[PDB]
Structures are given as structure tokens and as C-alpha cells.
Write a protein that binds this DNA or RNA. Structure first.
Lengths: 336, 345, 152
RNA sequence: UGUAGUAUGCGGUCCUUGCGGC
């Protein structure tokens, strides 16, 4: 009762429809997802090319998830050799490697622009979910920022009154008028700490003697800035991408669906009173389920002690801060 | 002029961003490419720079194995330049001058260039196989007639340098010509029950030919041994496709990785004002071949272990075989890591 | 010696000035148009040009395979998102199918056919060149939109 | 002419009941 169309060129739409009808066997998940996106028309006169409308061509959500995971599993041998080479690359450097399972659902790259409006970070060649190293480095840096703000908030605020005044003036300039309201909350401390770590690293020389307790170890501010680097000095810790272990993909699914059902969406966007006359607009998106095991590795360029400190910081961040998208809802959390 | 030539093969384990810095298209920070063709290449300057940095690190760490014997640069410099051995060492201690072996091979450091020229000359990392997604055979290694023609020209140059005509005709038995909708693909990529292939956006009729693909596989095997960067070479002979020139150009221009990155400000937890940018990356599992020519060293009073050109050839081959290097930017976030294999004819 | 860069810049300036003048009051329309313009190249590089055009048409609540750019009015939509999507689709398709004009240096790769229907039954090389031209014109349009149009 | 790595610093984030009624 649904009409499927394909905006790809002719002589290829037939093969795309064969792939989506399971008549043929596709092997690359990113290929079928992106380059062969179907446009589904329901009783409503509109070819909505969204996962909510894309799933309508299957029997149910379970069938869609099973099809996606079978397509993912069809490249298991290639992913296995790729992971073996990746582990060899890890061991080539003096990299410390640790494995972590997903405590809750994880979704990285949800904000990427795509036809589905809700994308997911999939490896181009093999079509498996992965965490880019940039995300890990950023989450570690932000966890360090949060720890510093929570512990040494008033101290750094007093030491850098000029910087906090500059930040308050900037906020007043952009955030409405707010001439001097500018509450000195934890968020302002985090902002000025980030500003110090990004544009005012040299002025952070005095603070470098400070130490903050992470997990069981103690990390200095100088250690953190050496690990991450500045505009004038390169970081010393190499953060590699994280990939799931190939073994677990054989038995449990590595990709599932999740739903967002925004009732009162006009209230949030347009300003209508919430009430209850606000029929929802469900939107589905892919996410790797909880329990999937990922392998992380951090290497060093100058000192292995910095690598160990960065590994501890990243473990703490993944345990508490969380990586990926919708981290405010407990998504993308890892457990030992 | 030159004496010998080795072939360096680079297999991109992670996406590689050899930055160019020339303007900014919609995909910001474009990679360096050949202007007239658009094919992605790594210029000799960057490859020589990273090789020189790795060699300097190895020599300072005292890990370079010459003739299966460890190389200590201090005692060698003393045996060569005993009059000023201390002073030159101070320059290395102050980073003014690079260590002895790197200065012999890659030339003297920037602080002084008129003394001698480099004994080595790297080449541009011309692409050989491109990873393109496929319906069957999850991803495929793709090549173009210009690619194999340039490989044959490179082989001819190697034969001329070494005066070895025997290796000249290794690839000289491969002439091809393909329409824009035809390809010579391995059995894995070919669709079941249909003599057609799909390379990430296109349905291509499978042209029937075996000598060309067999010769290409044999050439790769001769260049890089029987181990093709962690997997046997014979295991990928059925995942190779030779496509039309325009199709290969389109693959190299549009199938490259486009990575979006943002900066998260702690004041709000959202992307900052203009904190987002896109970067172009070479896809993972790509092959780039380069020529490294070597002649007589231009220095004076050389040690006996590096006296002749072959003593440099073997040292470079043993020190840069199945190694891992970082090319381009985003080193700190695990980008640009490549497996390097050195071969000779 | 008439470079296509001049035609690209002139067309982008004309279209961005047109949307700025026609909807100077609607700041949210300007913001939506700017966001769609600076996000379109990512969609084109990800899912292709035909998929992007079909996505715009779907966001316009219009059928595919039976709609051309000449038969859509960008101002005939109540919603700001629909307004911006229609304007972007019209501008991109107009540049692809006619260029800056018949007498200009660039007359569009497609003669006069609808770019989506052109993509449907053309070779991969033609759609690749069309994608390259669309990328360039979208880059210019995003540049000019960031220049003049207000930010959402 | 010789010597020379477009590199370092940046989280695709923020916002949303799988519901309403028998």
C-alpha cells in the first residue's frame, strides 16, 4: 500500500529496488543507506525519504533491523582483517589499548546532514559504527574542563578576573543585553577555562602547578595542555578511532532503531500553548545498542606517562561524561 | 646521475589528509591533487619531510640497523669529523643540524645547504588502487588506464636508471581500452546472475578480459611480495576493477571521505559560532606508489658502511619495510596513518 | 575570455539579492534559506544530486517525476521552511538548466530540461559534471547568503 | 641552485513522551 521511488539514475533504480526487496544481496551498508535512498509514499501524497517512512516497506521494525544487521554481517571477514591490521597499527606504536562495553545506547554523528535528517557514523568501506578520534579527544578535553571547573572554579576565576570580565562582556554583547547579570555559575567557569586552554595557554603557566584527581591518578594542568596541545605547541597523545570487536557482530546485532516522539513540538518551536492537541511527529534514527564492545587505543609521542594519563582521563570521560549524541539523556555511556 | 630506485607502497590504514591549503571549496580544506587530472597525489615534499623526520627520530633513538648492526651516530661522527665532532654534536643537541645519516641521505638541515646535496630523491605518491564501495564484494580496488600507463612509464624510468631492460617489459604486455560504461572486474564484484557490477553509484557492464588483471596482480606481487599489507595478494585478485578514465576521475573526486568537525564551547554545550568545518580525506584502504631514487652521496669522507649507493638502498629498505607513518594533518586525532612497504626490482 | 566564475558570482548575487529583497521582513525565511544553502553541499556529496533535489521536492510536498522547476512558485508556500526549500530548489535547478542566461557565457549544462528528469535518464559522467557545477554554484550561493542574509 | 611536511589548536553537538482513545 506504499509506493517506492528512487531518485537515482535509470538502470540502477531496478537494482536498488531489488536490494530493498531482499531479492538480491547487498554487502555495503553505507552504499544501500546513502547512495540508494528510497522515497516512500504512503496514503499521504508525499514521498517522504525519512527512516520513519523508509521502514514502512518492511513488515515491522524488527524486520528492518534484521535486514540492516544482515547487511552489516555480510562483510564480517573483511572487517575482521581490517581490525587485525588496526590492532597491528596499535601495537606498532607504544599505544595503550582498553576495551569497553556500551552501558547504554550510543549514537555518534546524529547531527550530520543527510536525506534521512538523522545520520550515523558508519565506516565507508565496511559500514560498521565507529567513534572518530576527534570525538574522543574532544570529550576528554571537555571532561578535563568540567573537572577543573568543579574543583578549581573560584581559584581560576580569581586568578583570571580579567579573562572572566572579558568573557562576561562578550556574553553581554551577544546574549541579548545582559549588561552585568552574567551569573558566575559553573558554566562561566567552564567557558573561561576553555578560553584559557584554547587562546590563552601561555597565561596558564602559573596554573600549571595545579593538580586534579582523576580516578586513582592525579593530573596536572601542564600535563593536560601537553597532552592536548595549543595553537603553538602540538599535542603529545595520539587519539585513535574506536571500532567494535568483530567477534560480537556474529551473534548480537550491532545496529538498532530508536524513536523520538516530539509532542508539543509547535510549543517548542512556534510558541503555541502546550495543551494536548499536539499530535506527535515520530522520527526514527539508527543507534548501536547497549552492550556492544568497542576497542580504544591512545598512543604517545613524547612520554608514555602522558599516554597513561590520557587513557585514564578518557576512561573516566566515557564512564561519566559520555560520547556521541544526546549525552544529556545517558546515551553513549561505557562500563568496565 | 642516479644509480638505483626503490618503490614505496603506502596503504592508508586510516583516512589520510595531505593538506593543500589552496582556496576552499564546499568541502573545505581540500587534499592535494594533480591540477590537470584531479587525481589525488601526495607531493614529494611532504613525503620526504615525514620520511626525514622518522629517520631523524630513529637515528637519535639509536634504532637504525645498518648491515644488521646498530648505528650510533655520535661515534660515527667522531670517526668522520673528529676535529669538530663535539661542535657538530652540539648543533644536533640544539637542533641546528640533523644527525649524520639523515644529513647524508636527505641532505643537510635548513641551517646550511651549500655543503652538499641529498643522496636521495623521493617521488610523488601517485595513486594506484582506489577503494570504491560495491554492492557485492563489499568494497573494491579500482584502477584506470592512465594509472597503469603511468605505472609503465615509472617502470621504464626505473629500467633506464638501473640499465635493466629485463624489468622494462614486465608490464609492457597490457594494452586496454574501455568505454565509459564498461569495466574489467574480479569475480567477487560481479553480480550473480547478471554480467554487471555496481561501483558505489554506477551499473557497469563487465568487459571480458583476463590478461590485464592477471598481469596487474603479478606486477603488484613482484613489487610488494606475496603479502599485500596484512593479507595475501592472491586474496584480493577478485576484487580489482579497471574502469573508464572519466569514471575513475569521478570516483577520485567525489568518493573521497568528507568529515564534518565542530568545536563545542563549554559556555552552552553547543557548537560555537562558526565552529564547524569540513575536511577532505583519502579513503581508508587506498594504495599510493612512489619512486625513491638514490645516487652517490654528495658528502665527503663517508663511513664505509654507507660508502656506495647500494649501502643506502639496503638501509632504506630495511628501515622502511612494513612500517607505519603519519601523513598530512590531524595526527593527534588518529588520521593519516599509513602502512609503508619498500620494494626493489 | 569569459570565465564561468563571473557568471557563477553574478547569478549567486542576483538570486541572494532577490530573496533578500522579496523577504526583507521575514528574517526567519532568510535564516532558513542560509542554513539550507550551507547544508546542501553536504547532502549532495552524501546522497547525490538527484537525491538532494528529490529531498527538496519532498520537503515541498510535491510529487516527483511530474514536477519541473519552471512550474513552482517559491512564494506560494505558507511555511518558512517550505519557502526556503522552494527558493533553494528553484535557484539550483535554474542554474543547472539555464545558467545565467541564454546570452550569457554559461547557459546551463542541461539545455532546458528539468535537472531531476535529466538526471533520471542520463549517463554517470553527465550527472557527475552536473554535480560539480551544482557544488560550485552552491558554494557561491552560500558565500553570498552568509554575506548579506541574516543568520537564524 | 642547494636545504624545507599546509602543519598545530576544534566533540556533528543542542532541542524533542511511541504516543492519543475503545
Amino acid at each position: 500500500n506504499v509506493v517506492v521511488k528512487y531518485p537515482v539514475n535509470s538502470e540502477l533504480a531496478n537494482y536498488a529496488e531489488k536490494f530493498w526487496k531482499k531479492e538480491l544481496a547487498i554487502y555495503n551498508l553505507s552504499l544501500i543507506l546513502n547512495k540508494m535512498t528510497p522515497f516512500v509514499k504512503r496514503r499521504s501524497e508525499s514521498y517522504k525519504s525519512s527512516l520513519s517512512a523508509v521502514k514502512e516497506i518492511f513488515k515491522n521494525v524488527d524486520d528492518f533491523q534484521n535486514f540492516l544487521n544482515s547487511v552489516l554481517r555480510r562483510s564480517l571477514d573483511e572487517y575482521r582483517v581490517f581490525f587485525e591490521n588496526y590492532e597491528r597499527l596499535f601495537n606498532s606504536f607504544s599505544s595503550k589499548i582498553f576495551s569497553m562495553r556500551t552501558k547504554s545506547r550510543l549514537v555518534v554523528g546524529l547531527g550530520d546532514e543527510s536525506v534521512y535528517e538523522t545520520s550515523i557514523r558508519l565506516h565507508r568501506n565496511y559500514g560498521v559504527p565507529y567513534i572518530p578520534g576527534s570525538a574522543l579527544k574532544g570529550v576528554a578535553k571537555h571532561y578535563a574542563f568540567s573537572i577543573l571547573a568543579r574543583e578549581n572554579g573560584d581559584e581560576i576565576l580569581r586568578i583570571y578576573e580579567s579573562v572572566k570580565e572579558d568573557l562576561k562582556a562578550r556574553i553581554a554583547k551577544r546574549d541579548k543585553i545582559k549588561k552585568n547579570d552574567v551569573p558566575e555559575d559553573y558554566y562561566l567557569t567552564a567557558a573561561v577555562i576553555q578560553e584559557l586552554f584554547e587562546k590563552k595557554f601561555d597565561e596558564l603557566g602559573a596554573i600549571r602547578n595545579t593538580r586534579v584527581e582523576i580516578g586513582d591518578t592525579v593530573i596536572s594542568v601542564g600535563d593536560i595542555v601537553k597532552i592536548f596541545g595549543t595553537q603553538k605547541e602540538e599535542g603529545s597523545v595520539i587519539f585513535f578511532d574506536a571500532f567494535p570487536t568483530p567477534e560480537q557482530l556474529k551473534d548480537k546485532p550491532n545496529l538498532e532503531l530508536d524513536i523520538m516522539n516530539p509532542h508539543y513540538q509547535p510549543y517548542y518551536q512556534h510558541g503555541e500553548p502546550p495543551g494536548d492537541w499536539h499530535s506527535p511527529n515520530p522520527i526514527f534514527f539508527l543507534t548501536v545498542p547497549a552492550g556492544v564492545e568497542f576497542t580504544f587505543a591512545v598512543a604517545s609521542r613524547d612520554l608514555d606517562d602522558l599516554a597513561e594519563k590520557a587513557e585514564k582521563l578518557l576512561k573516566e570521560a566515557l564512564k561519566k561524561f559520555g560520547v556521541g549524541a544526546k549525552t544529556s539523556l545517558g546515551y553513549g555511556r561505557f562500563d568496565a | 646521475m642516479f644509480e638505483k630506485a626503490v618503490v614505496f607502497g603506502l596503504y592508508s590504514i586510516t583516512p589520510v589528509h595531505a593538506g593543500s591549503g589552496a582556496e576552499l571549496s564546499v568541502i573545505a580544506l581540500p587534499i592535494q591533487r594533480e591540477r590537470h587530472t584531479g587525481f589525488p597525489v601526495i607531493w614529494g615534499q611532504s613525503l620526504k619531510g615525514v620520511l626525514r623526520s622518522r629517520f631523524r627520530q630513529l637515528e637519535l633513538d639509536e634504532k637504525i640497523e645498518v648491515e644488521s648492526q646498530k648505528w650510533k651516530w655520535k661515534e660515527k661522527t667522531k670517526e668522520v669529523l673528529k676535529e669538530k665532532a663535539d661542535e657538530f654534536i652540539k648543533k644536533v643537541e640544539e637542533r641546528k643540524r640533523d644527525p649524520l645519516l639523515t644529513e647524508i641521505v636527505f641532505g643537510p638541515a635548513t641551517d646550511g645547504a651549500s655543503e652538499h646535496a641529498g643522496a636521495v630523491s623521493v617521488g610523488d605518491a601517485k595513486i594506484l588502487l582506489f577503494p570504491v564501495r560495491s554492492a557485492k564484494g563489499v568494497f573494491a580496488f579500482v584502477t584506470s588506464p592512465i594509472v597503469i600507463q603511468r605505472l609503465k612509464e615509472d617502470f621504464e624510468l626505473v629500467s633506464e636508471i638501473e640499465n635493466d631492460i629485463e624489468l622494462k617489459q614486465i608490464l609492457s604486455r597490457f594494452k586496454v581500452e574501455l568505454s565509459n560504461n564498461e569495466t574489467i572486474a574480479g569475480n567477487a564484484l560481479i553480480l550473480n546472475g547478471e554480467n554487471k557490477v555496481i561501483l558505489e553509484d554506477i551499473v557497469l557492464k563487465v568487459k571480458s578480459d583476463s590478461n590485464v588483471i592477471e598481469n596487474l596482480v603479478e606486477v603488484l606481487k613482484t613489487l610488494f611480495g606475496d603479502n599485500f599489507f596484512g593479507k595475501p595478494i592472491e586474496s584480493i585478485k577478485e576484487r580489482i576493477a579497471i574502469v573508464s578514465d572519466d569514471v575513475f576521475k569521478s570516483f577520485t573526486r567525489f568518493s573521497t571521505e568528507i568529515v564534518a568537525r565542530v568545536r563545542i564551547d563549554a559556555e552552552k554545550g553547543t557548537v560555537a559560532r562558526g565552529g564547524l568545518w569540513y575536511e577532505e580525506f583519502l579513503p581508508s584502504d587506498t594504495l599510493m606508489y612512489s619512486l625513491i631514487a638514490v645516487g652517490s652521496p654528495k658528502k665527503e669522507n663517508l663511513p664505509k658502511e654507507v660508502d656506495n649507493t647500494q649501502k643506502i638502498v639496503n638501509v632504506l629498505k630495511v628501515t622502511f619495510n612494513n612500517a607505519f607513518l603519519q601523513i598530512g594533518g590531524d595526527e593527534t586525532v588518529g588520521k593519516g596513518f599509513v602502512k609503508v612497504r619498500a620494494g626493489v626490482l | 575570455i569569459r570565465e564561468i566564475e563571473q557568471e557563477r558570482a553574478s547569478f549567486a548575487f542576483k538570486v541572494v539579492s532577490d530573496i533578500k529583497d522579496k523577504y526583507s521582513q521575514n528574517k526567519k525565511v532568510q535564516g532558513k534559506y542560509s542554513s539550507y544553502a550551507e547544508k546542501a553541499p553536504t547532502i549532495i556529496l552524501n546522497n547525490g544530486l538527484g537525491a538532494t533535489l528529490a529531498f527538496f521536492l519532498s520537503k515541498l510536498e510535491k510529487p516527483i517525476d511530474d514536477v519541473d522547476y519552471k512550474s513552482i512558485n517559491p512564494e506560494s508556500f505558507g511555511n518558512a521552511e517550505n519557502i526556503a526549500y522552494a527558493f533553494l530548489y528553484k535557484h539550483l535547478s535554474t542554474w543547472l538548466a539555464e545558467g545565467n542566461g541564454k546570452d550569457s557565457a554559461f547557459s546551463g549544462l542541461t539545455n532546458g530540461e528539468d535537472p531531476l528528469k535529466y538526471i533520471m535518464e542520463k549517463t554517470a559522467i553527465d550527472v557527475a559534471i552536473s554535480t560539480e557545477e551544482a557544488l560550485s554554484i552552491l558554494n557561491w550561493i552560500k558565500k553570498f547568503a552568509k554575506a548579506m542574509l541574516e543568520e537564524e
